[PDB]
A paper describes a structure:
The classical model to study retinal proteins is the light-driven proton pump [name] (bR). Proteins that bind the common biological chromophore retinal are ideal for time-resolved measurements, since they can be activated with a flash of laser light. These proteins fulfil important biological functions, for example, in visual signalling as G-protein-coupled receptors.
Here we present the crystal structure of bR solved by SFX to 2.3 Å resolution using an XFEL. Femtosecond X-ray pulses at XFELs have been demonstrated both theoretically and experimentally to efficiently outrun the radiation damage processes with the exception of highly radiation sensitive metal clusters. In agreement with this, our bR SFX structure shows no signs of radiation damage in the Asp and Glu residues, where we observed depletion of electron density in our earlier Cryo-structure obtained by conventional crystallography. Intriguingly, the electron density for carboxylic residues is not always better defined when using data from the room temperature measurements SMX and SFX, as compared with the measurements under cryo-conditions. For example, for residue Glu166 the cryo-data gives a very well-resolved electron density for the side chain at 1.5 σ contour level, while the room temperature SMX and SFX structures at this contour level are depleted of density for this residue. In this case, even the protein backbone trace differs between these structures and indicates a mobile region of the protein. The structure obtained at cryogenic temperatures thus seems to favour one conformational state yielding well-defined electron density, albeit a slightly different conformation than for the two room temperature structures. We also observed a small but significant difference within the unconstrained region of the retinal β-ionone ring. These changes can probably be attributed to conformational motions that are obscured at cryogenic temperatures. Difference Fourier maps obtained from a pump-probe experiment with a time delay of 1 ms are compatible with the dark to M state transition and demonstrate the possibility to use an LCP injector for time-resolved crystallography.
Author numbering:
A (entry chain A), B (entry chain A), C (entry chain A): 5 to 154, 158 to 231
Amino acid sequence: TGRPEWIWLALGTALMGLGTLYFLVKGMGVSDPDAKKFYAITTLVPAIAFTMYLSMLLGYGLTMVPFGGEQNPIYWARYADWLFTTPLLLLDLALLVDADQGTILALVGADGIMIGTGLVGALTKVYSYRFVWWAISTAAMLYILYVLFFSKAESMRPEVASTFKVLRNVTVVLWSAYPVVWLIGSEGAGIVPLNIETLLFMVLDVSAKVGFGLILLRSRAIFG
Amino acid sequence: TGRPEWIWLALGTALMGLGTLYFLVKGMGVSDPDAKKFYAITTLVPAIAFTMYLSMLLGYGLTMVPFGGEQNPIYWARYADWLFTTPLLLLDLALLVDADQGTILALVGADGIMIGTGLVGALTKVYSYRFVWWAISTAAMLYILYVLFFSKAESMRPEVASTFKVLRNVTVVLWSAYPVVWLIGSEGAGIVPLNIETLLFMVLDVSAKVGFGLILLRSRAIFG
Amino acid sequence: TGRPEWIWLALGTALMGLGTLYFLVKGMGVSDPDAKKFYAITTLVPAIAFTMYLSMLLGYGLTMVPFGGEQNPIYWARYADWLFTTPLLLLDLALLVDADQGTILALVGADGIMIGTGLVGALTKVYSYRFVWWAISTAAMLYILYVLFFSKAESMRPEVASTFKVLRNVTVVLWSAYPVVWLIGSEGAGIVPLNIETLLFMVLDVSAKVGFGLILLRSRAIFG
Ligand SMILES: *C/C=C(C)/C=C/C=C(C)/C=C/C1=C(C)CCCC1(C)C
Ligand SMILES: *C/C=C(C)/C=C/C=C(C)/C=C/C1=C(C)CCCC1(C)C
Ligand SMILES: *C/C=C(C)/C=C/C=C(C)/C=C/C1=C(C)CCCC1(C)C
């Protein structure tokens, strides 16, 4: 296809596909109720990402948004991906630390706003307003990062506290990159071109989903 | 109206309407917490289907998708219907057998993918790619059917095991037809015309919702 | 901006923003699991409304629908707001009275239909059909009001029964106004112009979210 970024969409599609299949097969025969939850949640993440990457590869998950006197290619399918995958990833962390339901509802709500405002930002036709929505989404992200950092995992089992610590550190570092990439890429300032932006989001997505999942499902904390 | 398929949309609308009202009235005065859940879930299904059928009848739930050198009438409102009604139907089955939450999340996730990929298939403008999404959706269906077949209902009460068995058999046979109808109808190969396709989906929908519901709500398994 | 209704969108945006911030700060340091739920739910409501009001102010949450030989400005962003905020408000009430899950699923389902059918009504191009969807949505509202009125709060604590009583009375009176405003405004009969309609919805929204929240979070019923 004539779009330069197809290769990274293709690699993205393939790597999410492989990860889905790996987690499916790994979770076969697992009978422990708690372990089953973590496998269900963690396998769905790349499964969803696979379908959205495929949509981008085939050209369905793309549209043109006019701003700055140009038709700009915007991959809306990312936000459809992230709307479902990011709360599931937060839920993996929340179930691990046995978080109360009020805290879970706060994280998921804020995540919905973060993703929702991002999408509005992506599709906004007035250039200046795009950054207002970015700012609001980033504020929502910071709230999530604050809750993850400031907790009671050290009060319970060592395997749980240890695995939470690493997945928290991975999450905070990888998630924080997303707003930076948006800002400097096609959606924001347009400093880095769409092909490099697509490469960047692919490394981040695969790392935040497949990499994250491998760390979690190899841990002993997912069992009671 | 000039569309030949209106009569089946009208019949569909009427039969979902009657079924909603029947289940509403039947569930009046029911105070048992478990029974109330099943009535809530089972009454919502035709209520949702009623609204979407009405949308199709009035022409709101229809759009034209260009493929194969023709503007093809696509009823998108079906997928809006099914996105909500199919997980509720799976939940009726899951609550009946007291399925663990990991298994419930797996079924609902896979169902979301099945319906989501179906819709993308429905709206895709490149003919060949429509069948790629059909295949992925069908793969998601098979996963759901595998989980329903391979379970622990025989470990618990006889009324529960008996009612699960029949509703499982109805579900598997009726659900399996949907991908066949899509494939041979307007959305796929275009072998059967839209009016017959609409008739076929109406028989299936009414049977999988109203018929299914009658079997469930007349059973003694819904009570503790 | 050239739209007369901007001032009420601006005031709406500001008042939801202030309310979000007030509830955020008030809920800091609250460690009681039950209280945390109510703060999570109640803070998300204006947070969501803030983002949608902002969308309307900036012009994103608006589209033109042709009916009656005129392009009519329709703020679709309201329905996006209400789809999420109204079930959360019902959940505040349901958790307060310790409602069973069947009843919670009934309320939330009916609320989804109410909002969903409202949106279809809003975007329908055949004038007469707009009122059919209004009628169906209003029927769904009446069901919700019936469940709220006809319950067991008097069986449990006095602070809970007392706070439920006032929030029920506020809810029923404020919610009942919404269908009246739609009917007489731009979406329906077009008797009151869009600027007054926008003023009316803003008073209602702020009262049903911020006012409602203040009453709830100052009560002692949110604690165990
Ligand atoms: C599986 C993929 C993951 C974990 C994606 C995470 C994405 C974010 C944390 C995106 C954040 C954004 C902002 C906070 C600023 C606005 C632009 C977004 C949506 C990229
Ligand atoms: C109440 C209606 C029900 C139970 C509908 C069920 C629909 C399906 C199981 C549809 C399945 C499809 C595929 C697996 C292939 C792609 C086309 C679909 C979405 C019709
Ligand atoms: C936070 C805002 C609230 C509580 C909004 C409530 C809105 C309604 C109860 C709207 C009801 C409607 C009908 C029942 C008739 C159709 C038009 C609607 C959607 C305005």
